[PDB]
Structure 1
């Protein structure tokens, strides 16, 4: 009777297809590109053709074919560009046509007033059968739900757009509507609180309806199959995604970039690799520290080879007749192992370069607590060797975020290095990093960390990583990577603060043990510590056996954080079912790409 991620997939598929029925006859499909990916997780492209789709077209290509008569658009409705893009296309076929065509548009997840005004001041609003496609969480795994909002980080922290926060609230509210109110809403961070606030405002709006005869029968009471929801704001811990991830899936995302459980590679244009928990090999590989991937890859090749040789024993029909049956299951494992070898082998040559080791050296030194000034010459050498701008910016932001701002003298040298190394166009890139508050001067009030010494002052004072490093045992130089005993294995000695904060709630006994159920839940006993992380700390209460726990990340989560979280899910397998929710899957490069100006002072 509890929560199951598959019912999300099923509803998603059923709602889409039910709208395809609504459009009678065969149809040609037009999809927003960064929506096509996520869609492939809930529905087969096979299944779509059967429901009458002839050809597939990307919306941003402006090349919709006149093949079939019915043209169907599927795009996210919150997007200002998407509205214009479709509207432009509806004219690129009313003045180049051969027939009139009927136009259907499926807004995800809703039709917005803005969408209409853009469509209206082009006249094409009237010839449009507009329906809503309530997609929110895309179930990427059994324990991972993601809104798959790729620009959500830019939108939220730069553009100051409440849309991702809004959607996530709606998404979570959907969970409540089906399985009951979250008994507790525990969280940390400004946008985490915003999500909680939207969850209480939306709850009341459902009661204003039912009281005033809008009916809906009922009528939400506290759940019995959900323990709580824990909401973490990404802007509370920018450091973890900035660090170069050192798990297998992390490094794949760090180097190849993973989108919608997929990615592109060249060694058997390029080809699309599927990366999800289906592949039995990848399941075990993905969450492991990259060091032991060789050892793990070999052990499986060493075991596969002595499983092919095996069972030539009873050489009479049967024991061979039974062997050829289990034969396609060998070839798959054989082709999987070659892929995840080639990939591993390629990630290896990358980690052996002098630049990479120089990067890791600076990242590790800064995270460990070394004097950041000691990493200056190293950063300068990296700029001089023309290392990719994102990697350098990640260091500077890591530098800035971990030292409570940057010293005035060192700041000006850093700005000179970036500008004279990559382009004066990046006067804008640095300005964006300043608004994101990840590259600031020490003399800025926004750069200050939280201290119980420097009086009050500062409304939005930053996470004190220096304090939190000690108080929360952020550094574990122990941890063996062959058989991890702490989440700090995902960075080879560094435990992510974000997940460590989750442990302040979920694993109080363990967290106390390394610093020398029923209750008491909440932040109880870790109030002074969590006080030193950015933003509001909260724990609202809404009014038998194992229940599910939703760990929600507002503003992106990393593969390192997912693995670490999965590591905890196992340790808690007895009393809890942990389900991860997030606006998107984020990383250092996606974060930086949000701030980086691509214009160029060159020839047009």
Structure 2
């Protein structure tokens, strides 16, 4: 994923260099984060940027001749804020006050029109700034469309779907086209169809009398793209993450790897402790930080004492690492305290028992007493709401006689703002009710693929190994360990596409399913051998290949990949990907690492507390 950092920097810094003299830079707060990922303020100051302003708080000044704006053009908010600052700057400025505006990869006519209507933008220098798929992590590419999840499913707003297919085109057009496109879900299909049409646009530009025709050859380095919609798995997002990174996100929240507590230290995979602890189970990490403290203290507080240069130099060259580890260790110890206060208080373990018991198919009413205690203890809003939703999603619809008991805890837990919470849950389809006309679990060949159908967990729990009691928290052999045995469907639906061996072992579930093992093991390509399961999930199925004479040549080269020539695989989550899913994808990516490089691609990274607080953040 880090290879795109140069591209993102290239375009951002190029446009800034085009501005002569000293300039003030105005950055959208909701874009500044993603920008901070690729460049530092010092990177921008090296290009002549002096002051740093924001649009939302109307922060302006007249200190520089050139004023430069960076913002998303998918909303009028920025066009208005920019025009507002321009009008104020021109009124107070005693200089030429040249203005420059940098927009999304394709600046919109709407944005430009709104700017022009201001009457003060007539001399403005407006240009495209094609930043997409920000390098949030070495294995993760994110468009950072943080509001994508909410808008994409509350209003069915396709904006992130359109941006994603374009952003994906923005990669494959340079690294070669995906020889195969597959995916599951309504929005997943849209992305797959958009990618096919965008390829036609690249040839059509010549026929349109515009840009030169692209060769559009298939990639020799990229094997495939897998696109999965958020609507496909509405159960996984409702479980609390048990990993260390999950502890941080579940209690505090991770954005831009920055996060609240000090903004002096960034926590990411480059950290020597985080790369080892981030995927650790909460029951284990409490012992890993002590393991780190013992090994760190031995080299940091001892061994080097009284040593002469000949031996001391071994610790001197490493000391900077020991100091960083000690600083990160204290931070990690503070996170450990946060979990300890929930495990010694029967809060974290209590919600886990509910998640494990529901996953196994236990009657959800039996877990109600455990949920009531969590509400009574004033645990965080998203931690109670997840349990007050998951129970219905697992069952596939429950009678109102029982739903009301859980619903009472939703209104009691959220207060008068619960009205927005319930409306968002229904619109986001994260709450099921038997009384609904949409309360229909997909049946075998039951004309599946409609927007009014839901994934049949109660069937797929037998078709796939979604229930795992074999998880090893310290040394796991399955993704299920992230949830201590949940074996999340959103990942199984990807694993069964990524490798035929995964398909063979994943579908080896109940005694009426394992008979298909020999068929599942033949799924060398596409969805073959997985049709029984694909047909029982929500939304349509997409499977198409790249056209052209050399398509077979590239396909053979890509299926001939080896450890000395690893091939890249794109896994795409539409509507945003949760941290539990990212950790699960890293686990499988490591197992397949010997042959292929699997990269996680998303419209956004969903915080565990972002989905259940939609009624809180939009209520502020």
Same fold (TM over 0.5): yes
The change in CA–CA distance for 1:318 and 1:382 in structure 2 (over 3 A counts) is: closer
Displacement of 1:518 in angstroms is 11
Cα distance in 2, alignment partners of residues 312 and 396 from structure 1 = 54
Displacement of 1:412 in angstroms is 3.9
Matched residue, 2:62: 66
Cα distance in 1, alignment partners of residues 525 and 29 from structure 2 = 43
The change in CA–CA distance for 1:110 and 1:311 in structure 2 (over 3 A counts) is: same
Is the 2:381–2:613 Cα contact (8 Å) retained in structure 1? no
Matched residue, 2:345: 353
The change in CA–CA distance for 1:159 and 1:272 in structure 2 (over 3 A counts) is: farther
Displacement of 1:194 in angstroms is 0.5
Is the 2:479–2:487 Cα contact (8 Å) retained in structure 1? yes
The change in CA–CA distance for 1:214 and 1:51 in structure 2 (over 3 A counts) is: same
Is the 2:500–2:523 Cα contact (8 Å) retained in structure 1? no
Cα distance in 2, alignment partners of residues 175 and 61 from structure 1 = 35
Is the 2:136–2:256 Cα contact (8 Å) retained in structure 1? yes
Displacement of 1:107 in angstroms is 0.9
Cα distance in 1, alignment partners of residues 617 and 45 from structure 2 = 40
Cα distance in 1, alignment partners of residues 307 and 436 from structure 2 = 79
Displacement of 1:550 in angstroms is 0.4
Aligned alpha-carbon RMSD (Å): 2.7
Secondary structure of the structure 2 residue equivalent to 1:588: coil
State which drifts further: 52-61 or 403-412. Answer: 403-412
The change in CA–CA distance for 1:202 and 1:318 in structure 2 (over 3 A counts) is: same
Displacement of 1:218 in angstroms is 3.1
Secondary structure of the structure 1 residue equivalent to 2:617: coil
1:230-379 aligned within 5 A: 230-265=226-261, 271=263, 273-308=265-300, 317-321=309-313, 323-379=315-371
User: What do residues 184-237 of structure 1 show as CA deviations (whole Å, max 9, x unaligned)?
Assistant: 112111111000010011111111223455463531122111110011111111
User: What do residues 524-551 of structure 1 show as CA deviations (whole Å, max 9, x unaligned)?
Assistant: 1111012111111222111294311001
The change in CA–CA distance for 1:95 and 1:312 in structure 2 (over 3 A counts) is: closer
The change in CA–CA distance for 1:117 and 1:521 in structure 2 (over 3 A counts) is: same
Cα distance in 1, alignment partners of residues 447 and 199 from structure 2 = 39
Secondary structure of the structure 2 residue equivalent to 1:40: helix
The change in CA–CA distance for 1:550 and 1:167 in structure 2 (over 3 A counts) is: same
Displacement of 1:139 in angstroms is 1.1
Cα distance in 1, alignment partners of residues 523 and 353 from structure 2 = 42
User: What do residues 248-298 of structure 1 show as CA deviations (whole Å, max 9, x unaligned)?
Assistant: 111211111111122111xxxx54541211111111111222221122222
Displacement of 1:341 in angstroms is 1.8
The number of residues matched between the two structures is: 592
State which drifts further: 52-61 or 304-313. Answer: 304-313
Matched residue, 1:439: 431
Corresponding position: 1:87 with 2:83? yes
Secondary structure of the structure 2 residue equivalent to 1:415: helix
Displacement of 1:13 in angstroms is 0.8
The change in CA–CA distance for 1:231 and 1:455 in structure 2 (over 3 A counts) is: closer
Is the 2:67–2:98 Cα contact (8 Å) retained in structure 1? yes
Displacement of 1:482 in angstroms is 1.1
Is the 2:575–2:604 Cα contact (8 Å) retained in structure 1? yes
Displacement of 1:386 in angstroms is 4.4
Displacement of 1:454 in angstroms is 7.2
Is the 1:244–1:254 Cα contact (8 Å) retained in structure 2? yes
Which one of 152, 159, 162 corresponds to residue 156 of structure 1?
152
Cα distance in 2, alignment partners of residues 377 and 220 from structure 1 = 59
Displacement of 1:434 in angstroms is 1.7
Secondary structure of the structure 2 residue equivalent to 1:95: helix
Corresponding position: 1:17 with 2:13? yes
The change in CA–CA distance for 1:421 and 1:257 in structure 2 (over 3 A counts) is: closer
Is the 1:425–1:597 Cα contact (8 Å) retained in structure 2? no
Is the 2:149–2:576 Cα contact (8 Å) retained in structure 1? yes
The change in CA–CA distance for 1:335 and 1:468 in structure 2 (over 3 A counts) is: same
Displacement of 1:38 in angstroms is 1.0
Cα distance in 1, alignment partners of residues 170 and 229 from structure 2 = 20
Cα distance in 2, alignment partners of residues 219 and 114 from structure 1 = 32
Is the 1:252–1:347 Cα contact (8 Å) retained in structure 2? no
Is the 2:497–2:527 Cα contact (8 Å) retained in structure 1? yes
The change in CA–CA distance for 1:192 and 1:16 in structure 2 (over 3 A counts) is: same
Cα distance in 2, alignment partners of residues 306 and 392 from structure 1 = 42
Is the 2:448–2:536 Cα contact (8 Å) retained in structure 1? no
Is the 2:354–2:367 Cα contact (8 Å) retained in structure 1? yes
Cα distance in 1, alignment partners of residues 68 and 449 from structure 2 = 55
Cα distance in 2, alignment partners of residues 506 and 587 from structure 1 = 25
Is the 2:449–2:535 Cα contact (8 Å) retained in structure 1? no
Cα distance in 1, alignment partners of residues 432 and 450 from structure 2 = 15
State which drifts further: 351-360 or 329-338. Answer: 351-360
The change in CA–CA distance for 1:113 and 1:313 in structure 2 (over 3 A counts) is: closer
Displacement of 1:128 in angstroms is 1.8
State which drifts further: 335-344 or 569-578. Answer: 335-344
Which one of 122, 137, 143 corresponds to residue 141 of structure 1?
137
The change in CA–CA distance for 1:413 and 1:210 in structure 2 (over 3 A counts) is: same
State which drifts further: 405-414 or 166-175. Answer: 405-414
Secondary structure of the structure 2 residue equivalent to 1:383: helix
Cα distance in 2, alignment partners of residues 249 and 488 from structure 1 = 16
Is the 1:247–1:490 Cα contact (8 Å) retained in structure 2? yes
The change in CA–CA distance for 1:514 and 1:434 in structure 2 (over 3 A counts) is: closer
State which drifts further: 383-392 or 434-443. Answer: 383-392
Displacement of 1:565 in angstroms is 1.0
Displacement of 1:137 in angstroms is 0.7
Is the 1:242–1:587 Cα contact (8 Å) retained in structure 2? no
Cα distance in 1, alignment partners of residues 4 and 447 from structure 2 = 49
**Structure 1 stretches lacking a partner, 5+ long:** none
Displacement of 1:400 in angstroms is 2.5
Is the 1:148–1:585 Cα contact (8 Å) retained in structure 2? yes
Cα distance in 2, alignment partners of residues 312 and 359 from structure 1 = 46
The change in CA–CA distance for 1:299 and 1:203 in structure 2 (over 3 A counts) is: same
State which drifts further: 230-239 or 57-66. Answer: 57-66
Is the 1:433–1:595 Cα contact (8 Å) retained in structure 2? no
Is the 1:28–1:70 Cα contact (8 Å) retained in structure 2? yes
Cα distance in 1, alignment partners of residues 406 and 544 from structure 2 = 43
Corresponding position: 1:122 with 2:142? no
User: What do residues 148-181 of structure 1 show as CA deviations (whole Å, max 9, x unaligned)?
Assistant: 1110111211122111011111111112211111
Cα distance in 2, alignment partners of residues 457 and 376 from structure 1 = 33
Cα distance in 2, alignment partners of residues 320 and 598 from structure 1 = 56
State which drifts further: 468-477 or 109-118. Answer: 109-118
State which drifts further: 325-334 or 75-84. Answer: 325-334
Is the 1:394–1:588 Cα contact (8 Å) retained in structure 2? no
